Amino acid sequence: GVARAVARRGVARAVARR
Numbered sequence: 028g029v030a031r032a033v034a035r036r037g038v039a040r041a042v043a044r045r
Contacts, residue, residue, distance in 0.1 A: 031042040 029042065029044045031040045033040045
């Protein structure tokens with residue numbers, strides 16, 4: 028229901044909820 032798409036050096040997307 029809530030997934031983030033951030034792929035930066037230091038800030039990666041560890042947010043992945045349905």
